[PDB]
Design a protein around this ligand. Structure first.
Ligand SMILES: Nc1ncnc2c1ncn2[C@@H]1O[C@H](COP(=O)(O)OP(=O)(O)OP(=O)(O)O)[C@@H](O)[C@H]1O
Ligand SMILES: [Mg+2]
Lengths: 49, 49, 148, 49, 212, 198
């Protein structure tokens, strides 16, 4: 959620459409993970967060 | 004969009876039968009272 | 204990009746008149008022009695005229309470000869009010109108 | 220890030979769409008995 | 003599069709519902007149079939009078997992009551999570929005299986449900320890299953 | 037990097929010689048979048979699209008097297309395609497509019979009257049909 809020600020700073921002943010997050820029930890203990 | 066996092999019911050998399965089935008979006897005794 | 009784039956804008009220008797009430006068129609209105279940209602001729026919037409629609219609009963409770039960009937526009029903109930109505007058408005020189 | 291997390997490798079961799927009864109910209003009048 | 039921129909078949249970059952069966041991009324009925029903439905070019596990269902022929349809691959994933759950003695202590979350956890434990996510979305890469979408698709397909009679929800709680033996049809490709290709060929020949 | 004539009726070889059709909602007209005769012969018992399903077997005054589900129907129900009814009403209008001289009972898809377009209001048209659509080629194309689709649906209903060739030319059956208006003493069918269409 915090990463999505950060992406929203960038998009605002680039004056972009607020449509599908949650999707655009997920695409960007997945792209960063796919490009080895971010490490993602999926724990059963964190209820899937 | 082979065909017969093949035919039969599919027809097994559940895991505790998964002896892939039909003939072997027979006895297991019968065991079940006896088990069931005892349960029925107890249940009908309960029903009477 | 004093058993309850049906006081009267009222019909509005039925086939042949504009606004008519029959006062029932304590024991027996008889309807007479030549063929086609409207006796069976009065029976049907009463029953309708009693059990508005449209699924059930099926008014066969007296001939063909007892034959389960599934007829295309239940025979109620034709007994109603265009516009709004009513059928109501006045009852005296064992408690000596006056209660007015009834239904609002109305034909449905469309090829299928369907009918609409809306039940209602009235409690505490003064004894001096007649249903015939309660359900109509006096418009013009003694040329009353029915009201929805 | 018969079905563990038998079924787990099937789920693990399903996509190498994806298959689907058949079911009876009888047609639904087509009905008229109910149009908005249109009653007959005529403001009937008459002489009172 | 003339005007005698036997001229046109066996007495037992007419007796069955006249029963008060028949219309319900017929309607359901045609819709694809499987019948297990728990719905006594129906099951018992089926048992009593099995051969008459089979013979009856035969008129339609459809087989009334009895699996070894004791559950009845309808299998249409190629010339069927009644349409035939196939399940989706996600339905299969949930089906094979429900099957393993039924067998699992480790969870038998629950008395059959399982939760959608437990099903989901078992599924992701066995199948390739990230590759399976491809069916939810072509760009899925483990994002939580996509994980919630997967969970909702599962909830949906499960609801469809419920309608097929493969699973029963609790009377007051919808997050929990109980299994039935009808799920064993998802194991039809492995119940015999033989060559998978030959099994698959046999199944398609019998009309049990189609490829994609 | 079971009534003898009912057992006879459902023992007949034609029953399974007709059952299948009926349950689908198909209407049986005078065209289907054997099916129509079968229903005429065994109506009294088939009505009772289908009442067990909370479904009504009705013979229209024009002559065609069909099933009507109750609220409590044992058969899963389905409902038509607005566009569907639109088209249906159209076909009912085309069952006209000059039709005989105009087409000798055989129409084309274009007749219906153009009639639809000409007689309907723009707004409802839009509502049929998408509310954001506006008088565009693509829109018209999609509308055409939908028309074809719905027409096929109707053919399943038995309303319209396609002539046996790949081209889209058809004839209208009497059962289309189910779409039609209420008729009152002396009223002109053209006028009342148009009045509902409007
Ligand atoms: N559904 C209907 N549609 C049209 N006309 C109807 C309908 N039901 C009754 N009528 C007519 O209404 C009039 C009253 O009929 P009704 O049966 O009430 O009379 P009746 O006095 O009870 O006659 P009988 O004693 O012969 O039964 C008759 O002309 C009858 O033809
Ligand atoms: Mg009469």
């Amino acid at each position: 959620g915090e990463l999505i809020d950060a992406f929203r600020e960038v998009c605002k700073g680039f004056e972009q459409t607020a449509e599908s921002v949650a999707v655009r943010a997920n695409n960007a997050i997945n792209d960063m993970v796919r490009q080895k820029l971010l490490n993602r930890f999926t724990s059963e203990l964190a209820d899937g967060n | 004969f082979i065909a017969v066996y093949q035919h039969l092999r599919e027809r097994i019911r559940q895991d505790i009876i998964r002896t892939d050998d039909p003939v072997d399965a027979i006895e297991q089935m019968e065991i079940e039968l006896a088990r069931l008979t005892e349960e029925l006897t107890a249940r009908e005794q309960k029903l009477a009272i | 204990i004093e058993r309850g009784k049906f006081r009267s039956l009222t019909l509005v804008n039925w086939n042949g009746f504009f606004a008519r009220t029959f006062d029932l008797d304590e024991l027996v009430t008889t309807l007479s008149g030549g063929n086609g006068a409207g006796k069976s129609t009065t029976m049907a209105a009463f029953v309708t008022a009693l059990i508005p279940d449209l699924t059930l209602l099926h008014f066969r001729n007296t001939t063909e009695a007892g034959a389960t026919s599934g007829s295309r037409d239940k025979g109620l629609h034709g007994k109603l005229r265009a516009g709004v219609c009513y059928s109501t009963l006045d009852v005296i409770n064992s408690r000596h309470q006056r209660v007015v039960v009834g239904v609002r009937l109305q034909q449905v526009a469309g090829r299928d000869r369907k009918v609409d029903i809306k039940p209602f109930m009235i409690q505490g109505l003064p004894t001096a009010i007649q249903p015939t007058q309660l359900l109509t408005e006096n418009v013009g020189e003694r040329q009353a109108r029915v009201l929805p | 220890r018969i079905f563990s291997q038998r079924l787990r390997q099937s789920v693990q490798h399903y996509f190498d030979n994806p298959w689907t079961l058949t079911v009876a799927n009888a047609e639904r009864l087509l009905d008229m769409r109910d149009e908005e109910l249109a009653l007959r209003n005529e403001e009937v009048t008459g002489e009172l008995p | 003599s003339s005007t005698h039921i036997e001229q046109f129909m066996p007495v037992k078949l007419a007796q069955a069709l006249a029963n008060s249970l028949f219309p319900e059952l017929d309607s359901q069966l045609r819709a694809g519902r499987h019948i297990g041991i728990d719905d006594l009324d129906n099951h018992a009925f089926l048992m009593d007149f099995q051969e008459q029903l089979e013979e009856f439905y035969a008129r339609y070019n459809v087989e009334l079939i009895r699996a070894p596990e004791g559950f009845f269902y309808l299998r249409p022929r190629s010339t069927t009078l009644i349409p035939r349809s196939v399940l989706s691959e996600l339905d299969m994933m949930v089906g094979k997992i429900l099957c393993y759950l039924y067998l699992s003695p480790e969870r038998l202590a629950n008395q059959g009551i399982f939760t959608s979350q437990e099903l989901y956890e078992e599924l992701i434990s066995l199948a390739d999570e990230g590759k399976l996510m491809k069916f939810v979305n072509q760009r899925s890469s483990g994002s939580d929005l996509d994980k919630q979408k997967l969970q909702e698709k599962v909830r949906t397909t499960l609801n469809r299986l419920r309608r097929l009679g493969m699973v029963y929800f609790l009377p007051n709680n919808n997050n929990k449900f109980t299994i039935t033996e009808a799920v064993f049809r998802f194991g039809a490709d492995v119940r015999s320890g033989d060559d998978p290709r030959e099994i698959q060929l046999r199944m398609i020949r019998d009309g049990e299953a189609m490829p994609v």
